[PDB]
Design an enzyme around this catalytic site. Structure first.
Site, PDB file in Angstrom:
ATOM      1  N   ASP A 146      -8.683  55.787  68.871  1.00  0.00           N
ATOM      2  CA  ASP A 146      -9.225  54.796  69.640  1.00  0.00           C
ATOM      3  C   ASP A 146      -8.376  53.910  70.787  1.00  0.00           C
ATOM      4  O   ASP A 146      -8.733  52.970  71.324  1.00  0.00           O
ATOM      5  CB  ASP A 146      -9.847  53.612  68.912  1.00  0.00           C
ATOM      6  CG  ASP A 146      -8.625  53.141  68.118  1.00  0.00           C
ATOM      7  OD1 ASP A 146      -7.520  52.949  68.303  1.00  0.00           O
ATOM      8  OD2 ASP A 146      -9.055  52.510  66.800  1.00  0.00           O
ATOM      9  N   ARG A 202      -7.877  50.185  74.704  1.00  0.00           N
ATOM     10  CA  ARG A 202      -8.279  50.244  73.102  1.00  0.00           C
ATOM     11  C   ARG A 202      -9.868  50.181  73.359  1.00  0.00           C
ATOM     12  O   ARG A 202     -10.285  49.359  73.918  1.00  0.00           O
ATOM     13  CB  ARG A 202      -7.955  48.964  72.539  1.00  0.00           C
ATOM     14  CG  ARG A 202      -8.474  48.694  71.011  1.00  0.00           C
ATOM     15  CD  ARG A 202      -7.938  49.559  70.229  1.00  0.00           C
ATOM     16  NE  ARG A 202      -8.489  49.461  68.562  1.00  0.00           N
ATOM     17  CZ  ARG A 202      -9.603  49.380  68.129  1.00  0.00           C
ATOM     18  NH1 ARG A 202     -10.409  50.051  68.786  1.00  0.00           N
ATOM     19  NH2 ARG A 202      -9.583  49.265  66.936  1.00  0.00           N
ATOM     20  N   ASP A 210     -13.255  51.621  65.276  1.00  0.00           N
ATOM     21  CA  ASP A 210     -11.921  51.580  64.742  1.00  0.00           C
ATOM     22  C   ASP A 210     -11.859  52.935  63.770  1.00  0.00           C
ATOM     23  O   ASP A 210     -12.763  53.551  63.293  1.00  0.00           O
ATOM     24  CB  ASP A 210     -12.063  50.652  63.484  1.00  0.00           C
ATOM     25  CG  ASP A 210     -10.813  50.411  63.052  1.00  0.00           C
ATOM     26  OD1 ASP A 210      -9.711  50.402  63.643  1.00  0.00           O
ATOM     27  OD2 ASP A 210     -10.651  50.031  61.564  1.00  0.00           O
ATOM     28  N   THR A 211     -11.059  53.856  64.474  1.00  0.00           N
ATOM     29  CA  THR A 211     -10.530  54.955  63.908  1.00  0.00           C
ATOM     30  C   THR A 211      -9.421  54.938  62.942  1.00  0.00           C
ATOM     31  O   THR A 211      -8.615  53.837  62.881  1.00  0.00           O
ATOM     32  CB  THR A 211     -10.033  55.931  64.880  1.00  0.00           C
ATOM     33  OG1 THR A 211      -8.800  55.313  65.925  1.00  0.00           O
ATOM     34  CG2 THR A 211     -11.132  56.463  66.205  1.00  0.00           C
ATOM     35  N   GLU A 222      -5.933  55.160  61.083  1.00  0.00           N
ATOM     36  CA  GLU A 222      -4.430  55.239  61.738  1.00  0.00           C
ATOM     37  C   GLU A 222      -4.030  56.773  61.507  1.00  0.00           C
ATOM     38  O   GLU A 222      -4.828  57.354  60.639  1.00  0.00           O
ATOM     39  CB  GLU A 222      -3.529  54.371  61.183  1.00  0.00           C
ATOM     40  CG  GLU A 222      -3.828  52.680  61.364  1.00  0.00           C
ATOM     41  CD  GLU A 222      -3.503  52.569  62.956  1.00  0.00           C
ATOM     42  OE1 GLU A 222      -2.402  52.753  63.379  1.00  0.00           O
ATOM     43  OE2 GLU A 222      -4.454  52.033  63.581  1.00  0.00           O
ATOM     44  N   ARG A 281      -3.668  45.087  75.626  1.00  0.00           N
ATOM     45  CA  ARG A 281      -4.600  46.161  75.749  1.00  0.00           C
ATOM     46  C   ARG A 281      -5.853  45.940  76.269  1.00  0.00           C
ATOM     47  O   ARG A 281      -6.558  44.898  76.078  1.00  0.00           O
ATOM     48  CB  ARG A 281      -4.632  46.658  74.552  1.00  0.00           C
ATOM     49  CG  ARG A 281      -3.402  47.331  73.717  1.00  0.00           C
ATOM     50  CD  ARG A 281      -3.739  47.417  72.455  1.00  0.00           C
ATOM     51  NE  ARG A 281      -4.600  46.918  71.666  1.00  0.00           N
ATOM     52  CZ  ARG A 281      -5.124  47.227  70.524  1.00  0.00           C
ATOM     53  NH1 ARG A 281      -4.381  48.461  69.626  1.00  0.00           N
ATOM     54  NH2 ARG A 281      -5.614  46.434  69.576  1.00  0.00           N
TER      55      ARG A 281
END
Ligand code: THP
Ligand code: CA
Length: 129
Positions: free
Chosen positions: A15, A29, A34-35, A37, A75
């Site tokens: 992401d 971002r 939310d991907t 980690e 970001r």
């Protein structure tokens, strides 16, 4: 909302992507998702998926929402399109991201993404299996 040009510098993870935007390198971002980690389950598949999507694209565009354009880390906060396909949506549709970090004012595509999450969940894809 409007699409602006950018060019891939480097895939980062599921992401986050580094793109050149108005001639400056910036880390972007993805909004509303939310991907995992890289070190967590489906993290490598999420990084792999975003990577292919952005690297294969002939045309990358960014689309800012109505609210904050940068987060507290500097970001970018945006929707990214790869040959007109929204990366944010595609990850959720495949069950490689969850809808997340929904803040009022930067939430134009929330419903669309929730719709994709529903169908991913229905199919028990990846994170939902
Ligand atoms: C997606 C998004 C994340 N963020 C911030 C909140 C989180 O703060 P904290 O780092 O303090 O938890 C962090 C999550 O990013 P990552 O999922 O990339 O780690 O990025 C925003 O502030 N706005 C956003 O729209
Ligand atoms: Ca993440």
């Amino acid at each position: 909302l409007h699409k602006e040009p950018a060019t891939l510098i480097k895939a980062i993870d599921g992401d986050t992507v580094k793109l050149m935007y108005k001639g400056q390198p910036m880390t972007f971002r993805l909004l509303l998702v939310d991907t995992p980690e890289f070190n967590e389950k489906y993290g490598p598949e999420a990084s792999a998926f975003t990577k292919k999507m952005v690297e294969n694209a002939k045309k990358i565009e960014v689309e800012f929402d109505k609210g904050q354009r940068t987060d507290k880390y500097g970001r970018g906060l945006e929707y990214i399109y790869a040959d007109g396909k929204m990366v944010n949506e595609a990850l959720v549709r495949q069950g490689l991201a969850k809808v997340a970090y929904v803040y009022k004012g930067n939430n134009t595509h929330e419903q669309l993404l929730r719709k994709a999450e529903a169908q991913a969940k229905k199919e028990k894809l990846n994170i939902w299996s």
